[PDB]
């Protein structure tokens, strides 16, 4: 009974809207623009993970380091607890050692 | 919830040809959310199942169960609507083709036990359904006689084949 | 399982081999698509094999309908009225050819358990065994312990 009895409303996707049409443009800004701008500078998102990647523990550490002072009280407490738990898990648990 | 029993009275058949047997009238009636257990109602439904309207009313008038009065009221309403709307000529010329009790929407309550413990009561409700068919009640299925029983045995013997061979 | 599935006896549609063999398959409807990777094999089959198959099997009418389809299909209709629908979705040309040939060579009878690998309408030529075969007869048909 976890199956709907009617077809869901048709999902129409405009493959040629502006976003999809111009997606990927300026990805080669560096190599095609005398390397004035690195492609990572085209990344819009959280300040602490612009042009950067890492596991959950590294991401949490970076977030606390970069915006920890601007975080809300309970959010920062949660981040500290998450960093503590991730440290314990990654440094004391796992199949391989 | 489902309410198909009520809709079953709204089906309109095409006009019958002159050289066609007269289609017996069928009247579907029901009562919803009766404060009565469906298990208890089933016994009354089985009792009146297959009987004529008058015989069912007679049995229900003298049965002591609470559901008997409700079923009698439902049957009387069914008879009235069959005569008024479904073009049934005679009141007495109706028999209970179908009679069943269905589970209703029940309410959950708490029953307090001896040591701070409890049980979950259920304020049980039941539905009741009837189909009234015009015409005399069908004759009861006669018990199969020794002759027919031996005939069936001999047919079983004759049906034997040489199994697992050409 | 056999107990959970219907079964039948080995049989032919109209004693198909006695007088002359008759190809039971009569209709093959190929629903294909102009576009769609699923029916690429169906398109190649229609291009390269369907004509040869049609001329090899003159008793089968083949209807190739190219319409927008996500699952290309082949519907085989047999003389006995049986209709078998198969999906040729994402099947290569060789797979489609083998499937079509199997449909052509297959009769319309249901593909269910066959109780016996054989079927004789005249199983006995010398007389089916009964208890009185291989039993000598006595004078005047006297049963045992009969006095006269």
């Amino acid at each position: 009974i976890g199956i709907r009895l009617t077809l869901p409303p048709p999902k129409v996707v405009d493959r040629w809207n502006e976003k999809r049409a111009m997606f990927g443009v300026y990805d080669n800004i560096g190599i095609l623009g005398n390397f004035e701008k690195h492609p990572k500078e085209l990344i819009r998102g959280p300040i602490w993970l612009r042009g950067w990647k890492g596991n959950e523990l590294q991401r949490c550490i970076r977030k606390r380091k970069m915006v920890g002072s601007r975080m809300f009280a309970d959010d920062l407490h949660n981040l500290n607890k998450r960093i503590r738990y991730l440290y314990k898990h990654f440094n004391r648990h796992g199949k391989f050692r | 919830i489902s309410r198909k029993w009520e809709k079953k009275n709204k089906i309109v058949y095409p006009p019958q040809l002159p050289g066609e047997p007269r289609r017996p009238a069928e009247i579907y009636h029901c009562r919803r959310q009766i404060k009565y257990s469906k298990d208890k109602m089933w016994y009354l439904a089985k009792l009146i199942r297959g009987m004529s309207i008058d015989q069912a009313l007679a049995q229900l008038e003298f049965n002591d169960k609470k559901g008997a009065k409700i079923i009698k009221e439902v049957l009387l309403e069914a008879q009235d609507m069959a005569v008024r709307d479904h073009n049934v000529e005679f009141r007495s010329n109706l028999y209970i083709a179908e009679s069943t009790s269905g589970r209703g929407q029940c309410l959950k309550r708490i029953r307090y036990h001896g040591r701070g413990r409890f049980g979950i009561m259920e304020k049980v409700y039941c539905h009741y359904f009837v189909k009234l068919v015009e015409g005399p009640p069908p004759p009861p299925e006669p018990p199969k006689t020794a002759v027919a029983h031996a005939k069936e045995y001999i047919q079983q013997l004759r049906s034997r084949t040489i199994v697992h061979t050409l | 399982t056999a107990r959970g599935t219907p079964s039948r006896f080995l049989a032919s549609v109209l004693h198909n081999g006695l007088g002359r063999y008759v190809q039971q398959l009569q209709r093959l409807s190929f629903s294909v698509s102009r576009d769609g990777a699923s029916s690429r094999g169906a398109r190649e089959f229609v291009e390269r094999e369907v004509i040869d198959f049609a001329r090899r099997n003159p008793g089968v009418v083949i209807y190739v309908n190219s319409r927008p389809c996500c699952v290309p299909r082949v519907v085989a209709e047999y003389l006995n009225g049986a209709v078998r629908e198969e999906s040729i979705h994402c099947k290569s040309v060789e797979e489609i050819s083998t499937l079509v040939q199997k449909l052509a060579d297959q009769s319309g009878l249901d593909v269910i358990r066959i109780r016996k690998p054989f079927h004789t309408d005249n199983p006995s030529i010398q007389g089916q065994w009964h208890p009185f075969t291989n039993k000598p007869t006595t004078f005047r048909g006297l049963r045992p312990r009969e006095v006269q």
Binding site: - | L166 | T1, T5, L10, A11, S12, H15, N16, G17, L18, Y21, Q23, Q24, K102, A104, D105, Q106, S107, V111, I112, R113, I114, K116, P117, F118, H119, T120, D121, N122, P123, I125, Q126
Partner: protein, 101 residues
């Protein structure tokens, strides 16, 4: 296998025979030929000049799906396979004998 056969009989061989449907064949390994009043027995096979059994490849099919299930209790050992064995239905057109005794 050994089949007891008669004219108009049907036989279900459990494999493809690499023969087009409706094609006529001669069954060469005939162990026994029998009539109402006499029977001829090979040692172990009767002669070609004695007996001629002819059939026709009526149908080529796949058997109904057979389930092959393997299970061992308390070992997480459960396996399922579906197999369809190719089959050919043949109709035995005639059984002819010649006076070669």
């Amino acid at each position: 296998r050994q089949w007891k056969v008669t004219s108009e009989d049907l036989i279900l061989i459990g494999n493809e025979l690499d023969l087009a449907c409706g094609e006529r064949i001669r069954l060469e390994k005939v162990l026994l030929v029998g009539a109402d009043n006499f029977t001829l027995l090979g040692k172990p096979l009767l002669g070609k000049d004695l007996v001629r059994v002819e059939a026709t490849v009526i149908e080529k099919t796949e058997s109904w799906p057979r389930i092959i299930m393997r299970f061992r209790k308390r070992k997480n050992f459960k396996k399922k396979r579906i197999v369809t064995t190719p089959q050919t239905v043949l109709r035995i057109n005639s059984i002819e004998i010649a006076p070669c005794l």
